[model samples]
Target chain A: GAMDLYEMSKALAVGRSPQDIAATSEQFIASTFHARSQVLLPDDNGKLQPLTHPQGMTPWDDAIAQWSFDKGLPAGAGTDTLPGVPYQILPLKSGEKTYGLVVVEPGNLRQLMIPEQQRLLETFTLLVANALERLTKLAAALE
Target chain B: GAMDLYEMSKALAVGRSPQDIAATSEQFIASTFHARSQVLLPDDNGKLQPLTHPQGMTPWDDAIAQWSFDKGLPAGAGTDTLPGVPYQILPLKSGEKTYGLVVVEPGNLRQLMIPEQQRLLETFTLLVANALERLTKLAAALE
Candidate 1:
């Protein structure tokens, strides 16, 4: 009775654990972008100020923070150096409002984020954002 | 014109994204990991200061500044709360010469990086490292 596509995609995407592209993207931000965070602050002029620093903070910290406030919520991640810890931040937007930032940091990485990284980030961010919106509706309905 | 499942799986493992998976993952991050932008490094040498304090500077700049002040890079991107800009910095050293710090922001939403994601980042860096290493070797050979 529910949407088959959502369920199917979730199943397919939810492979492994935190490292799965989609899962990892969500997990990365689990610490940063949230209801209480400034990433989701009201941008309605004077409602919230883009602080010089993040108060609650997550591991991805600055990169994701920068992306989130840059109207690039659900930003994508990439590395320019690995085992060395290079990362990238991509934007995620729903219409005009950015939803969240995506943090992609490769572990045991050997290089930096490149064109391919761009593709993955772009694809993952869009998908994650859509799924989140649906979940939000479901949660609200339950509430 | 040809694609193998093993290779395909390998590709995905290294960070390939199926459309559905990407979309759903995007939603998960947007929905799940929602928080504020938290500044990770506010101090250096136990002194209160912004890690990447200077606005308009890149992560590289921050890292470079720290190195200039002392000799070692910071550890872990921020804290558990924050994830992704960069968690660790490893200096790529060759014969007492500093190449640069290897930056990595581990994947958070996911417990671990998908092999593909890991490989994706690693591959790029590895290429860079190889080139750098080779260049160094060539210099040595000339010397």
Candidate 2:
């Protein structure tokens, strides 16, 4: 069954375990769109890295990454961006705060044309950003 | 031609006018899924109302509304929800902040069982939320 973004958001907001949050987010994308994707988190150095080795996609290399981190928006991969690789880079942000990124590789060519798929990825980006931001704040509060 | 959510979102982030943002959001859903839909924004008192009268469907009198704002999830109108009218309710949200709701009536039933369409609506919900939230913040900052 398809997962609700709000349901995942509720789990994230309530301080659900990171693993749980990640699993649900992954499941929702996979079940709903059948897209292969990965979620990254910023390291202590502020560079984004994979939260986990995604099951279906290749490792995200900065060398092949397209969109500018400085730009603060989502970008699709192309011959000009990451040739041969099919993915879209979405920044996870809640206003001024930058959480991380979700790199999504479409499961099929049809996905590239559908505006809804792009919207879905953006929504997931927001969910990831909000949950991670909340977790970071909670961690800081506890310290 | 396909509309890119990232591009539309960039416009929103840069402080595009509300009408432009609304048009882009509405167009993405309507064009991608080829559905008849309406976006409802909250009134001054926080009750959700249609931004404008939808073109095709009957007026939303709460009789055909399926998902509850309290429930905080996307729901399809069905025998259990709203039996007669055909539609789906996607809550527009940025993280936990909900801006409004989009009522989408499918263009074709053949497009219904396709997972891509469901994903499309979910994604459109996110895009609408992000754009609306940005507009709201910009308005607040200016005031």
Please report, in order, the local distance difference test score of every candidate based on alpha carbons. Answer: 0.35, 0.61
lDDT of candidate 1 at residue A120, scale 0 to 100 = 38
Work out how many backbone clashes candidate 1 has: 77
- What is the per-residue lDDT of model 1 for residues B37-108, given as tens digits with 9 covering 90 to 100? 112221224332244433322354454434522443333343232234433433332223333334343335
Least well predicted 10-residue stretch by lDDT in candidate 1 chain A: A31-40
User: In every candidate, what fraction of the native interface contacts is reproduced?
Assistant: 0.00, 0.06
Q: Give the distance in Å from residue A44's predicted Cα in candidate 1 to where it truly belongs.
A: 15
List CA RMSD, all candidates: 24.0, 7.5
Count clashing residue pairs per candidate.
77, 2
Error of 2 at A96 (Å): 16
For candidate 2, give the docking quality class from DockQ: incorrect
Residue A78 accuracy (lDDT) in model 1:
38
Interface RMSD of 1: 23.2
lDDT of prediction 2 = 0.61
The CAPRI classification for model 1 reads as incorrect
Tell me the TM-score of candidate 1's A chain: 0.45
